[PDB]
């Protein structure tokens, strides 16, 4: 239902657009995908096994890259729809139905993904704002990972 105040979503959507958009060379996307997962894994390696189909065996495979991109692409759609609770609520329900109807996904894993992002992004974004993001990002996590044991 309710995610983050408007001025918040604003700070988040701006910083995010600074480092994530279709105008960015595939070379950076890759670097972000890896960074984010090579950090997720070092936090919860027990989760690395969930990415078989996407060839997690090799994180440098056109197969796995596409997966990190569609993950980050989904997190792209949420941040950019923060100002529309209506649609955002549905978009995050739809994402839960999937991450849940999938086996072995523990909610604590997302929490791991949260801390990863919180730590990773500030290395890419100028004057990254931890608070605005926390108020906007947390609702997203819990909304997406609503049902994960």
């Amino acid at each position: 239902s309710e995610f983050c105040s408007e001025a918040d979503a604003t700070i988040v959507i701006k910083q995010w657009n600074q480092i994530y958009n279709a105008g960015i060379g595939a070379k950076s996307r890759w670097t972000m995908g890896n960074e984010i997962f090579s950090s997720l894994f070092k936090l919860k390696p027990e989760s690395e096994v969930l990415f078989n189909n996407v060839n997690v065996a090799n994180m440098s495979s056109g197969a796995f890259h596409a997966h990190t991109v569609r993950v980050l692409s989904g997190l792209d759609m949420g941040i950019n729809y923060l100002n529309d609770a209506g649609t955002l609520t549905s978009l995050t329900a739809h994402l839960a139905a999937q991450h849940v109807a999938r086996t072995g996904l523990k909610a604590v894993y997302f929490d791991a993904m949260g801390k990863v992002l919180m730590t990773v992004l500030p290395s890419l974004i100028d004057n990254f704002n931890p608070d605005a993001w926390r108020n906007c990002l947390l609702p997203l996590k819990n909304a997406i990972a609503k049902g994960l044991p």
């Binding site: 279709a22 105008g23 595939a26 495979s61 890259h65 529309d84 549905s90 978009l91 739809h94």
Partner: protein, 146 residues
């Protein structure tokens, strides 16, 4: 065709026309209003996402999902591997829907009309037509986009 030069281009024109934040929702609503006017029938193919009303959060979310996808796909135009891996991943998600490839042609014209009408006169219609045939062939597989 759709050589890397045009791929890097379609990426810029897109990123520009698509915008961020509210821009995205708005751009998508125009693209889909274009699709359902180009092909009224195409609409009934989306009853499951409340296509009865385009303003319903059910359908706005669908728009968010699709052109949200279009965004990611186009974002990889410069990485054959990834682009193809994910362009394939979509084919499997769309294959079972048993969709007439003719709509993918409409999605092409809808897309063009919206990016072009949003980006201004310097819209590269050719570059766009070509590099989109790549996405359609990757999704539909129909030799209509060859």
């Amino acid at each position: 065709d759709c050589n890397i030069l045009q791929r890097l281009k379609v990426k810029m024109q897109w990123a520009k026309a698509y915008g961020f934040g509210t821009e995205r929702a708005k751009f998508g609503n125009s693209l889909w209003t274009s699709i359902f006017n180009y092909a009224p029938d195409a609409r009934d193919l989306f009853k499951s996402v409340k296509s009865e009303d385009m303003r319903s959060p059910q359908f706005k979310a669908h728009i968010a999902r699709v052109i949200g996808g279009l965004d990611r796909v186009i974002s990889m135009f410069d990485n054959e591997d990834a682009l193809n891996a994910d362009l394939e991943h979509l084919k499997s998600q769309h294959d079972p829907r048993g969709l007439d490839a003719l709509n993918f042609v409409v999605f092409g014209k809808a897309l063009f009309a919206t990016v072009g009408g949003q980006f201004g006169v310097c819209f590269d219609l050719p570059a766009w037509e070509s590099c989109y045939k790549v996405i359609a062939m990757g999704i539909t597989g129909n030799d209509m986009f060859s």
